[PDB]
Every structure is written in C-alpha cells, then in structure tokens.
Amino acid sequence: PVIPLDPARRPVIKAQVDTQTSHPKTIEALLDTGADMTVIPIALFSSNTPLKNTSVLGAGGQTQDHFKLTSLPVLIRLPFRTTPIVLTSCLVDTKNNWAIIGRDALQQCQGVLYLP
Amino acid sequence: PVIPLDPARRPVIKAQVDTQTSHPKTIEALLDTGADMTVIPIALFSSNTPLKNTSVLGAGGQTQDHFKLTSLPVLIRLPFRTTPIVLTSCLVDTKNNWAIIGRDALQQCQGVLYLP
Numbered sequence: 001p002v003i004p005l006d007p008a009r010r011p012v013i014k015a016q017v018d019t020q021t022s023h024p025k026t027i028e029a030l031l032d033t034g035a036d037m038t039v040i041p042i043a044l045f046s047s048n049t050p051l052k053n054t055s056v057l058g059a060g061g062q063t064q065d066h067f068k069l070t071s072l073p074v075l076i077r078l079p080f081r082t083t084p085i086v087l088t089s090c091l092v093d094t095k096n097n098w099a100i101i102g103r104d105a106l107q108q109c110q111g112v113l114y115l116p
Numbered sequence: 117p118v119i120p121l122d123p124a125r126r127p128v129i130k131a132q133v134d135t136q137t138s139h140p141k142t143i144e145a146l147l148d149t150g151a152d153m154t155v156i157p158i159a160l161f162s163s164n165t166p167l168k169n170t171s172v173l174g175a176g177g178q179t180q181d182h183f184k185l186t187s188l189p190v191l192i193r194l195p196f197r198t199t200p201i202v203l204t205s206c207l208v209d210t211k212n213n214w215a216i217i218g219r220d221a222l223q224q225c226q227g228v229l230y231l232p
C-alpha cells in the first residue's frame with residue numbers, strides 16, 4: 001500500500017517474523033529507508049541460539065555489543081504478501097527490542113520511496 | 117521521483133540547505149523514513165550561531181549532548197522542487213556530520229513510502 005510520511009506517526013507495519021529459532025511471531029516494525037539491514041528484537045529468538053558479533057552504525061556513533069547478527073536466515077511475511085522475505089542475515093536488538101524493516105527487506109517487497 | 121530501495125545503495129539526494137546563518141549549501145542527504153526529524157551537519161553553520169540542547173533516542177542507548185536543535189527554521193531545496201522545504205527546526209549533528217532527510221521534510225514533499 002501507500003504509506004504516508006508524517007513526523008508525528010512512525011511509518012510502521014505488522015510483519016510476521018520467522019527467526020527459525022521459535023514459532024513465527026507477528027510484530028510491529030518500523031519501515032526504515034535509512035536502514036541498510038533489518039533489525040529484529042532478540043525477544044523473537046530462543047535464548048539457546050547462536051548469534052554473531054559485529055559493529056553497527058547507530059544514532060550514538062558506534063555501539064559494540066548492542067547489536068548482534070543472526071546465524072540463520074530470517075523470513076518475514078507482510079499482511080499483503082503471500083511469499084516470505086528471506087534475509088540472508090539481519091541485525092538482532094539485544095536490548096531496546098527494536099523492530100526495523102530496512103532496505104534489505106524493502107528491496108524484496110519492490111518497495112520504493114516516491115517524492116512528487 | 118521514484119527512489120528504489122536497495123541495501124547496497126542508500127537513498128541519498130543532493131539538497132540545498134539554508135541554515136539562515138550562512139550561505140546556502142548543497143549536501144548529500146540520506147532519505148530516512150525512520151527519522152522523525154531531519155539531521156544536518158554542523159559544518160553548514162557558523163561557529164558563532166546559537167543552538168539548543170536536546171535528547172534523541174538512538175542506537176547504543178542514550179546520548180545527551182550529541183545532537184543539537186536549530187533556533188531558526190531551516191530551508192531545504194531539492195533538485196525537483198523549486199519551492200523550499202521550511203523546517204520549523206531540525207537536528208544538528210555536532211560530530212558525525214550526518215545529513216538525513218526525515219519525515220518532517222518528507223511530509224512537506226508530500227513524500228510517501230509505497231510497497232506494492
């Protein structure tokens with residue numbers, strides 16, 4: 001659909017996220033054209049699954065251990081999408097519990113930004 | 117125009133930014149639907165202009181003095197718009213010198229995010 005842009009209303013969408021480490025869960029994710037990679041809350045994984053370390057660009061500069069990387073792909077389903085989005089890797093939020101749909105996912109939705 | 121989304125290429129645009137504290141400047145700004153407010157590099161200002169302090173939620177926890185707020189509106193011109201965007205105020209990056217077009221600006225462009 002068309003998602004209007006308003007500073008007062010975050011552009012969020014409901015997405016079913018399959019971490020492949022527990023049952024799929026529908027969560028509210030922010031549609032973020034500025035995000036190179038999707039961000040998923042660690043609450044969506046098991047506490048017995050391996051994640052890999054890595055640096056990430058963030059609003060505070062550089063955060064070492066805030067974000068982890070997934071080890072298995074993550075499949076993401078949209079309300080209007082029969083087929084799943086498959087991201088070879090995406091970030092995992094071990095603290096803030098952020099849900100961010102980045103450009104990696106938006107590319108597979110054939111999603112675009114339109115400025116009249 | 118229509119700006120495709122790809123994790124490998126950021127949705128950037130050249131924007132003329134008029135801080136009203138020096139001459140207008142063309143910079144390359146990242147189009148960011150996840151940014152509630154625009155961020156512009158302090159390199160655009162004078163070293164004699166007043167900015168106001170402000171908190172912002174960001175990756176890595178909480179940063180008190182990283183971002184400043186403008187005191188005068190900021191005018192932004194894009195290549196496809198003769199008329200300027202006028203932001204009552206927007207954030208100023210005192211370190212990374214980020215250029216981010218947020219939803220405050222995208223709303224005035226009547227910008228939207230479209231996923232088929």
Ligand SMILES: CCOP(=O)(COc1ccc(C[C@H](NC(=O)O[C@H]2CO[C@H]3OCC[C@H]32)[C@H](O)CN(CC(CC)CC)S(=O)(=O)c2ccc(N)cc2)cc1)OCC
Pocket residue numbers: 032033034035036037038039056057058059060091100102145146148150151152153154155172173174175212213214215216218
């Ligand atoms: C000029 C280009 O800057 P650079 O010098 C440094 O890279 C950058 C690339 C993008 C961004 C922007 C930022 N990215 C990001 O954190 O996402 C990361 C995950 O995925 C990877 O993939 C690349 C990104 C990472 C978000 O989109 C938007 N934010 C909020 C959101 C949570 C509310 C998630 C943080 S907000 O904090 O900025 C912000 C919040 C509220 C406001 N009212 C105003 C601003 C900043 C720096 O690039 C040149 C090498």
